[PDB]
């Protein structure tokens, strides 16, 4: 009973450790999956928006510069 | 000198209408100057949209 529970909980600990590793790696996969290309696309479209603002900003600069 | 008397009276009549028109144009010229004085807000505005049309032939 004593050594029984010892080995049992020891195996539970090892299993739980492997489970933690699995969840951890799952989060790792999620980030490495497509989050980086997603934000790259976001920044790309944002860059396009800056090209949009590149025109009208000139007029505001002109207003400041008379 | 009858026609000379007519000449004198008629040149004076001409002078009357002449000066009359002078006074008219003077009050009018004041209106003109006032109009343009109110209208001089088109320097920077015109320059702004001049830059607009300039950048149309830029990109």
UniProtKB/Swiss-Prot annotation, chain A:
It is found in: Chromosome, Centromere, Kinetochore; Cytoplasm, Cytoskeleton, Spindle; Nucleus. Transmembrane segments: none annotated. Coiled coil: none annotated. Belongs to the DASH complex ASK1 family. Component of the DASH complex consisting of ASK1, DAD1, DAD2, DAD3, DAD4, DAM1, DUO1, HSK3, SPC19 and SPC34, with a stoichiometry of one copy of each subunit per complex. Multiple DASH complexes oligomerize to form a ring that encircles spindle microtubules and organizes the rod-like NDC80 complexes of the outer kinetochore. On cytoplasmic microtubules, DASH complexes appear to form patches instead of rings. Component of the DASH complex that connects microtubules with kinetochores and couples microtubule depolymerisation to chromosome movement; it is involved in retrieving kinetochores to the spindle poles before their re-orientation on the spindle in early mitosis and allows microtubule depolymerization to pull chromosomes apart and resist detachment during anaphase. This is DASH complex subunit ASK1. It comes from Chaetomium thermophilum (strain DSM 1495 / CBS 144.50 / IMI 039719). The lineage of its organism: Eukaryota, Fungi, Dikarya, Ascomycota, Pezizomycotina.
UniProtKB/Swiss-Prot annotation, chain B:
GO terms for molecular function: microtubule plus-end binding. It comes from the Eukaryota. It is found in: Chromosome, Centromere, Kinetochore; Cytoplasm, Cytoskeleton, Spindle; Nucleus. GO terms for biological process: attachment of mitotic spindle microtubules to kinetochore; attachment of spindle microtubules to kinetochore; cell division; mitotic sister chromatid biorientation; protein transport along microtubule to mitotic spindle pole body. The keyword Cell cycle applies. The keyword Cytoplasm applies. Belongs to the DASH complex DAD1 family. Component of the DASH complex that connects microtubules with kinetochores and couples microtubule depolymerisation to chromosome movement; it is involved in retrieving kinetochores to the spindle poles before their re-orientation on the spindle in early mitosis and allows microtubule depolymerization to pull chromosomes apart and resist detachment during anaphase. Component of the DASH complex consisting of ASK1, DAD1, DAD2, DAD3, DAD4, DAM1, DUO1, HSK3, SPC19 and SPC34, with a stoichiometry of one copy of each subunit per complex. Multiple DASH complexes oligomerize to form a ring that encircles spindle microtubules and organizes the rod-like NDC80 complexes of the outer kinetochore. DASH complex oligomerization strengthens microtubule attachments. On cytoplasmic microtubules, DASH complexes appear to form patches instead of rings. This is DASH complex subunit DAD1. It comes from Chaetomium thermophilum (strain DSM 1495 / CBS 144.50 / IMI 039719) (Thermochaetoides thermophila). The chain holds residues 18 to 73 of 108 of the full protein.
């Amino acid at each position: 009973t004593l050594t029984e529970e010892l080995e049992k909980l020891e195996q539970q600990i090892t299993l739980t450790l492997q489970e933690i590793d699995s969840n951890f790696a799952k989060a790792h996969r999620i980030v490495t999956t497509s989050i980086l290309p997603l934000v790259e696309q976001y920044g790309e479209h944002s860059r396009a928006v800056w090209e949009a603002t590149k025109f009208w900003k000139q007029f505001f600069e002109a207003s400041a510069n008379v | 000198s009858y026609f000379e008397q007519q000449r004198q009276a008629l040149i004076e009549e001409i002078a009357m209408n002449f000066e009359h028109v002078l006074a008219n144009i003077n009050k009018l010229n004041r209106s003109l100057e006032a109009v343009i004085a109110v209208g001089n807000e088109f320097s920077s505005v015109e320059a702004l949209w001049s830059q607009f049309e300039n950048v149309m032939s830029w990109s």
